């Protein structure tokens, strides 16, 4: 799980998109923030479509 701190838990429903992560052994899979119980990263403002974060609504 990427982001900055997951909302995720223990029996919550999630989405995989794959893709190896180099550091971590045997992990071939990114959980993808946005869909399901994998909610987005709060206060991303830049790279946020990779992270299920909808727009900072402007005034």
């Amino acid at each position: 799980i990427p982001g900055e701190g997951h909302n995720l838990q223990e029996h919550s429903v999630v989405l995989i998109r794959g893709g190896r992560v180099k550091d971590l052994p045997g992990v071939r899979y990114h959980i993808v923030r946005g869909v399901y119980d994998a909610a987005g990263v709060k206060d991303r403002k830049k790279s946020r479509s990779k992270y299920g974060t909808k727009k900072p609504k402007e005034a």
């Binding site: 900055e4 701190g5 997951h6 709060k42 206060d43």
Partner: protein
Amino acid sequence: AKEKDTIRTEGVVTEALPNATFRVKLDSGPEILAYISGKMRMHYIRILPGDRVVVEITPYDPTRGRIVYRK
């Protein structure tokens, strides 16, 4: 944001393992996998079994820690 939920609890070192990973028995209660600080490694400060280090702890999983301070 840097989530500052990081649990700054002390523990006396039970055991030594490789890569400077250490089962440390806490003031808090449990003995959990807690690996070294990078800082300590840089400074060559040898953690040895029977020392009161500060094991920082994640609320996602307490069962793994991170050794912060020199004994």
